[PDB]
Amino acid sequence: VLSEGEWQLVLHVWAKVEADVAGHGQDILIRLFKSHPETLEKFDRFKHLKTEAEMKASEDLKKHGVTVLTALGAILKKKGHHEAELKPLAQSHATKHKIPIKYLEFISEAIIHVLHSRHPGDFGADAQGAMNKALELFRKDIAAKYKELGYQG
Numbered sequence: 408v409l410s411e412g413e414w415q416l417v418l419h420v421w422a423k424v425e426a427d428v429a430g431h432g433q434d435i436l437i438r439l440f441k442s443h444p445e446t447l448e449k450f451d452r453f454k455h456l457k458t459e460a461e462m463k464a465s466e467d468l469k470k471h472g473v474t475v476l477t478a479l480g481a482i483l484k485k486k487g488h489h490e491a492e493l494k495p496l497a498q499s500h501a502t503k504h505k506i507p508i509k510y511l512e513f514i515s516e517a518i519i520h521v522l523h524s525r526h527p528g529d530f531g532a533d534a535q536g537a538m539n540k541a542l543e544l545f546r547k548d549i550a551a552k553y554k555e556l557g558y559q560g
């Protein structure tokens with residue numbers, strides 16, 4: 408359970424992200440795909456991209472990055488009371504997209520790295536730990552829906 412102070416740290420940085428949702432989403436998916444290439448293989452949409460320059464030039468990858476971050480933003484702003492917003496994300500990610508929990512750990516590391524790069528003054532260690540805790544709570548609650556559905560592993 409995050410504390411109110413920890414939520415304030417999370418959403419203080421998140422408000423900085425919302426000024427350039429698309430640039431953040433490009434940098435986080437690129438980082439994800441370069442750091443963990445198995446992840447790129449899950450997107451039929453993107454698996455033609457073979458260099459980071461091709462990734463950076465894809466408008467469709469930029470579009471999906473905004474989809475991802477808008478969904479995550481709507482979850483963080485519920486401060487833990489996010490059951491309505493995860494149901495559908497867990498259902499589609501487990502049963503249609505086939506994404507293992509560990510790849511949600513990987514995109515969480517990429518989100519944390521990009522935020523540190525772009526917002527160091529609002530993303531010191533207190534805010535890094537709170538955001539870690541927020542992303543762990545996301546993964547915990549998604550893992551429980553996976554497990555219901557027979558996909559936790």
Ligand code: HEM
Binds near residue numbers: 446496504510511
């Ligand atoms: C913060 C974590 C994430 C969030 C908030 C998120 C959000 C979304 C949303 C809102 C969609 C479109 C609606 C839907 O299908 O449910 C989506 C689609 C999809 N996601 Fe995620 N996602 C996350 C992580 C991942 C990860 C780590 C992967 C792959 C490794 C992945 C793979 C996909 C795929 C394959 C689709 C369909 C893309 C297409 O072909 O249009 N997602 N995601």
